[PDB]
Each structure stands twice: as structure tokens, then as C-alpha cells.
Design a protein around this ligand. Structure first.
Ligand SMILES: CNc1ccccc1S(C)(=O)=O
Ligand SMILES: [Zn+2]
Ligand SMILES: [Zn+2]
Ligand SMILES: [Zn+2]
Length: 572
């Protein structure tokens, strides 16, 4: 019970008992917390509770020090000092933002705004408090017990009465019972086991509530600027393929950390793999939150870097399928590709963290605690999608509040910016450039003349709260008959339920906007489905239309985003 104050570092025995993380608070700060919040239980070697037998006084403001013990107003001896006096709580070794982080329920956007504008130690307190609140919230939903098994990919469930029913999308991963993780999609439901098993009737599923570990390392280490490239040895013979990034690779070697903003198809993976060809002796650990993002870095590495010095780190509890062409779990190979939660304790000359909009401050801190590096590179785009905030229901989280790195890219600007989109037809580049990049994103491709927009509100139906628009899928069906080249298109929408209906009526491969991020397809068919804050989000809109290499068909619901689309309008 001897720790350091989360607000001023002053050595103390005091920890708040009403805080779910029980942070160490100094005498001066513990006071300004207990007197300003409903938090009155103070902890030390022993709790600050009335020592008198059968007495339930636990409020620190209703307690005193009677010699060496603690008592309330009704049990204190004559020679007793109040615990709360002169702006201090009695302790050994003798706040507005801390109070709000300590007592908030994390359902409001202003909670996440504060969690990112506060001091660095408050960002860590905010990050483990939030994560602990998110885990304890999982204990609230109901158990799904199997009622009947139809086939290898379909079943019927019986839900627990009196406890809510969680959203049945791939975002929510149940743990079967210990018969492996299982995912679900829409009374005939579709079941997806990570481990192949002949689903037993009566066997039950539950949401795994992993333990939240305390955070030690900052989200961002303190910045260092150098006068020359430090600990890295560049090549003079660097292929013309990577010549565009030489000046940026040098910036990478002359700073402790650097930020790269890369709009869709501007060459982020190329920059990341090319950083290894520029510092060919450097050991580089490549990391991201998702397995898909780590796999996208493995694909680009497999093309330019020696396959023998590569290794894809897979956690022992292997959940879903990932990259199979590197030696698995060889921690000491020069190039290590691994997700943030699976990172071993190691050092590196460079750490590359990709898809930075998807990271939380918890992930930012974890990377700094597991990896000790000469240089850190954060690659991503704050105009793309962030990590889902399951508790957040009121308000919209702006990009400068996604994490510390995103806050930096939006306020002081990114250190590096890839300005030429090589993927998209100019119609798409011109739309997103004006929408989210302040007209700074340039088109390498010409206009494809295969980008269409239709304004069709249709009819909105709902599977629980996930939306469907059958008339918008009907409009797509009529379009496909007159445009058979579009037979090879990927159907994208902001809702899983819309995607489930489109898969059966159109037969096209389906993808949510959130699961499409990082991927590219020749043709994309997007139905907006609704006019909600979710389907109108400019980051989601940006990701949705920047997936296409050749053409896109956008069936819009919102007049605003329809009018901004620089596409050929269609009739019906
Ligand atoms: C018909 N749409 C279109 C075409 C070319 C350039 C700009 C637009 S707009 C005004 O909708 O942004
Ligand atoms: Zn507290
Ligand atoms: Zn303090
Ligand atoms: Zn008492």
C-alpha cells in the first residue's frame, strides 16, 4: 500500500476505494477528490472506517484520528483530529478532470474528449478505468443456450430472461462452453465456430470478460529530436521504387517518434516495408490492433523482404485464421509481425504501428510497455474509422479524440503526409479530398467514368436495431441486369443486416464499411441504407467510397452526401 499519486506523483499510502481502479492519491489530492465527488471511501494499510464495533461509518469526512485508530463523530475520543482538514486527508508522506474521469459512466462523448485532453497520467487512468468499465458491462447481457442444430453453418437459440440480448454481429465474440470462440449473423441464425465442433444442443455461449491490466508506459513516449539519424544505418543504394520516401525515412531516423497520415491508397504499406529496405540492418517490429492489418503488412513484406528474416507471431490461443508464409513465433527474426495484444517483451531499432485510427490509448500504452525502441512510427489516417466504443451512446467522437496520435495529427498536423492516391478513379479522389482532406489529396488515376450515384430513400426496416433497405437492394438488382460487368462487385453497406439481405438477393460478396477498411476491390456497390448519424459519418463515408479501384455505385439516403458525390447521377 505504498505507491505514487496519479495526479502529482507525491508518495502516499492513500488509494481511493470508490474508484474502480483504486488509484494512489496524495494527501492534498485525495482531499480535493473526496470533497468534490460521491467518492468517500479512502484506503491505506487499513481502510478509513470507524473502528467502533458494529459501526458502519466509512465516509472519510465523517471520521477522525483517535490516537492511532479511526472513529466517527459518535465514537471518537476527546483527543481526535478530523481526517479531512486544511485541504488534506491524513496520510503518510505529507483535480476537476480527475473527478470526471473517476465518476463518469463512459456513455457520453465528452468523457472520451476529456480522456484525451487530460495530462498523460490521467490518459492512463482514463484508459484502464474505461476498459474495466467496458469489461464489467459484459457481465450484464444474457446467456444463449442452444435449442436445436439445423446444419454445419445454421442453428436456433434460447436467450436468458431478464437480461438484454447483445448485438449479433461479428463485433461480439462469444465463448462457447470451453469449446472455442464462436461468432453469429442473422428465426434461422448462422453460427461460426473458430474451432470446428458438432454444436451440442443445450451447450451455452457467454461473452468473455478479460481482466484489465494496469498501464505503466505513456501513450506516447516524450518526443526527442536529433541532429542526425540515430542508431540506424541507411543504404546509399535504395531502389527507385522507394525514392519518394527517402526524405521521410530520414525524418524517421532524426526523431524518437513520427506520425504518417496516409489517405486511402497513398502508399502506407509501401512506406512501412520500404523503411526496412532503407535501414537494412535495423530490426523492425511491425504491429497493429487487428490480425487483418498485421497480415496486410506481411503481404507487402513477403514481396520485398527476405522471407527467412520474417516471423508472424500468433498467440497460443489462436482465435481466427491469419498469415501462413513466415516462420511462426520466432520472436528473434529481424522482422516481427504481431498484433498489439500478442506482443512479446522485446526491443527494436524501429517499431511501426499501423492503422493508428483503430488504436485506443490502452493499445498505445501497451505497445510502449512491451516494446523498447530507438524509433517509433505511427501510420494511419484520422479521416478513417476508429475503434468501436461499445459504451458510447450519446454524442459523436471526433478524430482528434480517437487516441493521442490522432489528437496530434489533427491539432499540430502529421509529420509526414502521403498526398497522391494511386487507387481510386479521380471522381472518388475529388470527393473525399474535399470532404475530409481539405483539398490536399491528389488523384493519380484519371476519372474512370464508372462512378454512379442514385438518390433513393427506399423503405427502412430493422432487425432489432441493425437496418435493412430492400428497395435499395432492388434498385441494385435492376442496375446489375443492365450492367453485367458489375457482377464481380463487392456489396458494402453500414449494416450487417442490410449485407445479409443483399447476399441472398444479389449473390455478391458482402462487407460492412468497418470491415472493408484496409481492403480494395475493382468494383464496389454501396447502399447507404438509412440517414442515421452512423450511415452519415464522414469517416465511414470516406472509407466506404475509397475501396474502389475502377467503379462505384452509391445508392444514397442523405441529400448532403449525395450532393457532394462527384459521380454521374442515374435515373429510376
Ligand atoms: C453531378 N455531380 C458532380 C459532378 C462533377 C463535379 C461535381 C459534382 S457535385 C456538384 O455533385 O459535387
Ligand atoms: Zn474516487
Ligand atoms: Zn497528488
Ligand atoms: Zn462510529
Amino acid at each position: 500500500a505504498v505507491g505514487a499519486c496519479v495526479l502529482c506523483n507525491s508518495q502516499t499510502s492513500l488509494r481511493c476505494g470508490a474508484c474502480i481502479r483504486r488509484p494512489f492519491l496524495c494527501c492534498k489530492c485525495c482531499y480535493d477528490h473526496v470533497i468534490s465527488t460521491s467518492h468517500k471511501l479512502v484506503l491505506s494499510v487499513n481502510p478509513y472506517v470507524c473502528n467502533a464495533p458494529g459501526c458502519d461509518v466509512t465516509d472519510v469526512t465523517q471520521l477522525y484520528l483517535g490516537g492511532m485508530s479511526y472513529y466517527c463523530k459518535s465514537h471518537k475520543p476527546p483527543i481526535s483530529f478530523p481526517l479531512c482538514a486544511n485541504g488534506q486527508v491524513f496520510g503518510l508522506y505529507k483535480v476537476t478532470d480527475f473527478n470526471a474521469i473517476a465518476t463518469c459512466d463512459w456513455t457520453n462523448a465528452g468523457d472520451y474528449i476529456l480522456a484525451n485532453t487530460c495530462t498523460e497520467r490521467l490518459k492512463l487512468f482514463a484508459a484502464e478505468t474505461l476498459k474495466a468499465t467496458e469489461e464489467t458491462f459484459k457481465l450484464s447481457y444474457g446467456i444463449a443456450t442452444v435449442r436445436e442444430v439445423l446444419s454445419d453453418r445454421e442453428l436456433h437459440l434460447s436467450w436468458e430472461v431478464g437480461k438484454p440480448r447483445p448485438p449479433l454481429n461479428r463485433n461480439y465474440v462469444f465463448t462457447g462452453y470451453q469449446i472455442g470462440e464462436y461468432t453469429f449473423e442473422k428465426d434461422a441464425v448462422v453460427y461460426r465456430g473458430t474451432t470446428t465442433y458438432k454444436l451440442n444442443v443445450g451447450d451455452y455461449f457467454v461473452l468473455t470478460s478479460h481482466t484489465v491490466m494496469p498501464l505503466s508506459a505513456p501513450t506516447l513516449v516524450p518526443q526527442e529530436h536529433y541532429v542526425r539519424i540515430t542508431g540506424l544505418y541507411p543504404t546509399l543504394n535504395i531502389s527507385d521504387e522507394f525514392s519518394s520516401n527517402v526524405a521521410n525515412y530520414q525524418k524517421v531516423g532524426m526523431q524518437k517518434y513520427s506520425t504518417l497520415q496516409g489517405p486511402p491508397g497513398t502508399g502506407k504499406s509501401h512506406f512501412a516495408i520500404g523503411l526496412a529496405l532503407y535501414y537494412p540492418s535495423a530490426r523492425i517490429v511491425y504491429t497493429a490492433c487487428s490480425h487483418a492489418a498485421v497480415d496486410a503488412l506481411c503481404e507487402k513484406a513477403l514481396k520485398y523482404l527476405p522471407i527467412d528474416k520474417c516471423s508472424r507471431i500468433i498467440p497460443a490461443r489462436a482465435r481466427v485464421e491469419c498469415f501462413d508464409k513466415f516462420k511462426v513465433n520466432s520472436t528473434l527474426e529481424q522482422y516481427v509481425f504481431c498484433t498489439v495484444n500478442a506482443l512479446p517483451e522485446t526491443t527494436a531499432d524501429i517499431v511501426v504501428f499501423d492503422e493508428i485510427s483503430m488504436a485506443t490509448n490502452y493499445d498505445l500504452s501497451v505497445v510502449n510497455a512491451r516494446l523498447r525502441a530507438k524509433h517509433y512510427v505511427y501510420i494511419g489516417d484520422p479521416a478513417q474509422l476508429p475503434a468501436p466504443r461499445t459504451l458510447l451512446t450519446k454524442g459523436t467522437l471526433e478524430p482528434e479524440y480517437f487516441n493521442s496520435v490522432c489528437r496530434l495529427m489533427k491539432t499540430i498536423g502529421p509529420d509526414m503526409f502521403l498526398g497522391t492516391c494511386r487507387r481510386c478513379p479521380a471522381e472518388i479522389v475529388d470527393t473525399v479530398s474535399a470532404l475530409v482532406y481539405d483539398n490536399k489529396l491528389k488523384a493519380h488515376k484519371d476519372k474512370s467514368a464508372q462512378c454512379f450515384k442514385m438518390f433513393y430513400k427506399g423503405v427502412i426496416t430493422h432487425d432489432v436495431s441493425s437496418a435493412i433497405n430492400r428497395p435499395q437492394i432492388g434498385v441494385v438488382r435492376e442496375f446489375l441486369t443492365r450492367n453485367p460487368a458489375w457482377r464481380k462487385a463487392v456489396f458494402i453497406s453500414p449494416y450487417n443486416s442490410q449485407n445479409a439481405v443483399a447476399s441472398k438477393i444479389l449473390g455478391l460478396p458482402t462487407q460492412t464499411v468497418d470491415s472493408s477498411q484496409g481492403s480494395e476491390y475493382d468494383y464496389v456497390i454501396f447502399t447507404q441504407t438509412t440517414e442515421t448519424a452512423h450511415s452519415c459519418n464522414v469517416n465511414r463515408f470516406n472509407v466506404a467510397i475509397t475501396r474502389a479501384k475502377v467503379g462505384i455505385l452509391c445508392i444514397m439516403s442523405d441529400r448532403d452526401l449525395y450532393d457532394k458525390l462527384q459521380f454521374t447521377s442515374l435515373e429510376i
